[PDB]
Structures are given as structure tokens and as C-alpha cells.
Amino acid sequence: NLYFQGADSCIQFTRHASDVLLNLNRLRSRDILTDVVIVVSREQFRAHKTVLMACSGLFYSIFTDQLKCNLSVINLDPEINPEGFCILLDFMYTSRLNLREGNIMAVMATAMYLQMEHVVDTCRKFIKASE
Amino acid sequence: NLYFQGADSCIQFTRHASDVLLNLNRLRSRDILTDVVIVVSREQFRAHKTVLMACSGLFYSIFTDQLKCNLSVINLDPEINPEGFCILLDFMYTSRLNLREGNIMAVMATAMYLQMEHVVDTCRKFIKASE
Ligand SMILES: Cc1cc(NCc2ccccc2F)n2ncnc2n1
Ligand SMILES: Cc1cc(NCc2ccccc2F)n2ncnc2n1
């Protein structure tokens, strides 16, 4: 079955959350209802503010700010590596984190800046395994 | 661990999709970045168009329409039961479907109208078990 008896009264659908995320990523790929452009070292990434806020403490802070919530363009710190940001943006929309020896430092520094502690801790654990 | 080696190269975060959905529901509860009001028999429900489109074929069709995508208010068919709609809206944001003997017919008819076939099939299976 696609469902089960949850701990509470309700039946719960096993694949619902992952199917929603897959569909949000399909909207992103098709540029449907994207409402922000994230600029990183002149690279541009179109996304949905709600997805960014649901994954990142920095984006949650920006988009809950009365002044900043209505910005259509957000420029990140020029020190931020676009590949590191791209890997984290894909992670937000897919649950898959493409960590490689060549990108782990950029991913970790970007996750720190974006306040994604779970990703930072994961990078730290992978780095610790190599030393 | 909060992660595993996916079938592909990437590490995957087990709870990421459900955590995103939980956070989207927290935004909904706080009325943060909600961009549409769904009106059902004069009852109003604030939501995020992207979440609605990711769950419902009717909302996908409406919000991908060049004319309708920019509507802030969507009126549903007056035949639609507000409780049935509320139960399905909560399901979209939580993966939990509060089916009860007293609401199953309204939920099924609403899921048919909203084009949520997985929910319709589930209602059909529960009804079949009672006969
Ligand atoms: C605790 C919480 C956090 C959060 N977003 C920011 C965020 C998400 C994931 C990981 C780290 C992080 F800082 N949101 N968004 C809506 N409601 C929330 N409640
Ligand atoms: C196949 C698909 C469907 C869909 N939304 C509509 C929808 C969602 C869940 C269940 C039924 C349904 F009709 N979206 N949304 C973005 N990309 C999509 N791709």
C-alpha cells in the first residue's frame, strides 16, 4: 500500500512528501511560479521563496523580513562559490546531496552561510572520516 | 544517521522531504508567503499555489494557465463541501488524511473534483471494505 495507520488517528501516505518535493522540483525545472532569482558570483538561480525558507535559516530570515520579503532578486555574498550553492539548491529540491572530495569544502562553507546546520554537520563527519 | 547512500551517487537525507513539508505547513499556519485564497461555500482557505499544484491536477491546470496563474482568489464549485476541502488541504501539507465514516463521501467527491486520483482510489478501497 501507499498508506499506513499513523501514530495519530489519520492514515498517512508514505510517498506524499517526496512526491510533493519531486513536483516542486518539476515546477522549478519548468520555471513555473518561481518568484525569486538568487545571484551568486554573477550566476543566477531561479527558485521558489517558500522552498528556500523551508530549508535555510538565512532564507527564512530574509523572506520573513517585512522589507526583504518582496525582493525578486537576492544577491549572496560574492565569496560564495556558485557550484556549492547549486549543489545545495538541488539538495533542497531533491533530498540528494552531491558531496564530492572536490566540492565538500565549498558545500560546507555555503551551508554555514545559508544556515543549514544538518548539511554542515554532515560535511564535518565526511571530512573527519578522511583525516 | 539522518542520511544514506542513494541508488545514484548522492547521499540522501531520509527526513528532508517530510521536514520541508512540515516547514511549508508552518508557513501556512503563520500566513507566511501564502499567495492564494481558496473560497469554498464562502469559507476561505489561504495557501501556497506551488503546494496546491504539486498535489492536485485541478490546481496544476489553473496555476499553469497564462490568464489564471495571477489570480489571488479562486472560487471552487459551490457543491464542494468545505470540510472535505479542509481535510484535503491538511493532507496536502501533512501527508495525513483524516478519513472518517462521516466525511469519506465528501472527501472522495472533493478529491475527484481536485483530481487527486491516489486519494480517490484510497476512499474507494475504504468504502469497498464497509460493503
Ligand atoms: C524550525 C523551522 C525552521 C524553518 N526554516 C529554516 C530552516 C529549515 C531547515 C533547516 C534549518 C533551518 F534554519 N522553518 N520554516 C518554516 N517554519 C520553520 N520552522
Ligand atoms: C505528473 C505531475 C503532476 C503534478 N501536479 C498535479 C498532481 C500532483 C499529484 C497528484 C496528482 C496530480 F494531478 N505536477 N506538478 C508539477 N509537476 C507535476 N508533475
Residue numbers in the entry:
A (entry chain A), B (entry chain A): -1 to 129
Copy out sentences from the published article reporting this entry, exactly as the authors wrote them.
B-cell lymphoma 6 (BCL6) protein, a member of the Broad-Complex, Tramtrack and Bric-à-brac (BTB) / Pox virus and Zinc finger (POZ) family of transcription factors, plays a key role in the formation and maintenance of B-cell germinal centres. BCL6 has an N-terminal BTB domain, responsible for obligate homodimerisation; a long unstructured central region involved in interaction with the MTA3/NuRD complex; and six C-terminal C2H2-type Zinc-fingers involved in DNA binding. Disruption of the SMRT or BCOR corepressor interaction with the BCL6 BTB domain is sufficient to inhibit DLBCL cell growth. We established a robust, soakable, high-resolution BCL6 BTB domain crystal system which allowed us to elucidate the binding mode of all nine hit series and map the binding site hot spots in relation to the binding of the corepressor peptides.
In these crystals, an uncleaved N-terminal Flag-TEV tag replaced the WVIP peptide bound to site 2, stabilising the crystal packing, but leaving site 1 unoccluded. Using this crystal system, we solved crystal structures of the BCL6 BTB domain bound to 3 additional hits, increasing the success rate for the structural characterisation of validated HTS hits to 92%. As expected, in all 12 ligand-bound BCL6 structures the compound binds in site 1, which is consistent with the competition with the peptide-based probes in the LO-NMR and FP assays. Despite their low chemical similarity, the different compounds all bind to BCL6 via similar interactions, the vast majority mimicking the interactions of BCL6 with its corepressors SMRT and BCOR. Importantly, all compounds, except the cyano-trifluoromethyl pyridines 11 and 13, interact via an H-bond between an NH group and the main chain carbonyl of Met51 in BCL6 similar to the interaction formed by the Trp509 and His1426 side chains in the BCOR and SMRT corepressor peptides. Additionally, all compounds intercalate between the side chains of Tyr58 and Asn21, as observed for Ile1428 in SMRT and Val511 in BCOR. Furthermore, all compounds except 11 have a substituent that stacks against the main chain of BCL6 residues 53–55, mimicking the interactions of the side chains of His1426 and Trp509 in the SMRT and BCOR peptides.
